[PDB]
Amino acid sequence: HMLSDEQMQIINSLVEAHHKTYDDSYSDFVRFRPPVRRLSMLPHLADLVSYSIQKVIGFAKMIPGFRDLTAEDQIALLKSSAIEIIMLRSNQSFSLEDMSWSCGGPDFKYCINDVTKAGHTLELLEPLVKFQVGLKKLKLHEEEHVLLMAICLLSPDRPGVQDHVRIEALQDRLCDVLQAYIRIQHPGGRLLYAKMIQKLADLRSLNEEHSKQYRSLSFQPEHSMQLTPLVLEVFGSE
Amino acid sequence: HMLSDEQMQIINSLVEAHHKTYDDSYSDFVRFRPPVRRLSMLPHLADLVSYSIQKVIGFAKMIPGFRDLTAEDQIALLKSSAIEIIMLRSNQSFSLEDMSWSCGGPDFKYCINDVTKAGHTLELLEPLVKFQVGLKKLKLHEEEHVLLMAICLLSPDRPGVQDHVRIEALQDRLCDVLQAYIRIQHPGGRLLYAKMIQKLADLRSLNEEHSKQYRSLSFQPEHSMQLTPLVLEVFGSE
C-alpha cells in the first residue's frame, strides 16, 4: 500500500539516469552525418542509432544491480536488448499527430519513408509504428517508462546470458517496483502493468525483424561501410 | 625526343581518372560529420580521409595495368600506399599563403592546429607541411602530379606484395613516361624528375610516422569508435 525506501531509491536513481542520457532538445543531432532525402538515409540513421547505443549503455550502468554483473552478461544483455531499448526510448520523440519521430525541424523529423531509405522494409516499420502508437496511448508516467526500459534490459531470456538467476532476481525486484508504483501512484492503472509487459513481447518480435534486416545490410560491404564501429560491434555476431 | 602513342595513352587515361576522382569544389565535405573547434576534429578528418580512400581506389582501378594484378597485390599496394597518395593528392588544396588546406570557407580550411585536434602530434605535421610546400614549389603540371601518384601506388617495396616483378614493370613504364614527359614537355624541368623521386622517399618517412601515430589511436576504443570501417580496414593490421 506504500512503496518502501529501497523501491523509491530504485525509482529515483533510474529516473535520474534517464534524465542524464536523454536530451529532449536533440541538439547533438547536428554532429551526425546529415540526412539526405541507394539508401540515402543510412549514414544519418547509423549515426543516430550509434549515439543512442552510447546513451543506452549509460542508462544501463546506473540500473541498480547492473554494474555488479560480470562484463560478459552486461555485454550479452546490451547486445540483445539495445534495439528494444532504442525502440522504447524513441517513443519520447514519437508524435501521434504526424506518425513520425519529431526530433527537430524538417531535418530530424523522421517519417516512415525515411527509415525505408535506410534499408528497412515495411515488414519491420509497420509493426514498429503501431507499437509506438500503442505505447504512446498508454501515456506512461516517467517512472513507468524508465522502469519498463530497465525491465527490458534485465531479461534473462537472451542469447549469451550466463547468470540468468541473478539477473532474473534483478528483473523481479524491478517488476515489483513497477507493480507497486502503478497500484499506488497511477489512478486507472489497474490494467496498465499487464499491457506494459505485453509490450515486451511485441519488442521481441520487432527485435527479430530488425536483426533479420540488419543481417542483410551487414553482408553488403557497400552498406556496412556506412555503419559506425559501435553499431557493428553491438549488432554483430561475435 | 617525342612521346609514343602508348606513353600518351597512359597520360590521357591517368589524367582522366584524376579528373573523375578529385572534385576541386570540395562540395561533398558537407556530407561529413562536421568539424569542431579530447580530439574534437577526429570525426570530420576520419570522414574526410575515408572519402579520400574511396577516391584513391577509383584512381587505382584506372592506372593502366593495375586492374590486371591479383586482388591480393591490389590490396597490398592500396593498404601501404593510401596515406601517401592522400598526402600527395592533398597538395592540390594546399595553399602556400596560409599553410593550410583550403577546401572551403572557415569550415574546411584545415590549419595545422586542426589536425592536432585529431590525435596527431607535430612530429608528423611538421615534416608533412614542409613536404607540402616543397611539393608545391615544384609547380608540377597536372600530368606530372598524376604520374607521380601512380608511381607511388606502384611501388614494389611494400609489405604484402607478391608479384613485385610485374608491378616493378608497371612502375618502370610510368617512370619512363614521366621522364619522357619532363624532358619533352617542361622547360627548365631538367632537374624535376630527380626532385620528384626524392619526394617519394619523403613520403615513406611521413607514412611511417603516420602509421605509428594511428596505431596509438586504433588501440584506444574511445577514439577508434570515431573511425569509419573503411579507414579501419585500410590502416588496420590484418
Binding site: 549503455i57 550502468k61 547486445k79 560491434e233 | 576504443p221
Partner: peptide
C-alpha cells in the same frame, strides 16, 4: 568487443 568493454568503464 573492444568498444563495449571500454564504454562499460
Amino acid at each position: 568487443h573492444k568498444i563495449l568493454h571500454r564504454l562499460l568503464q
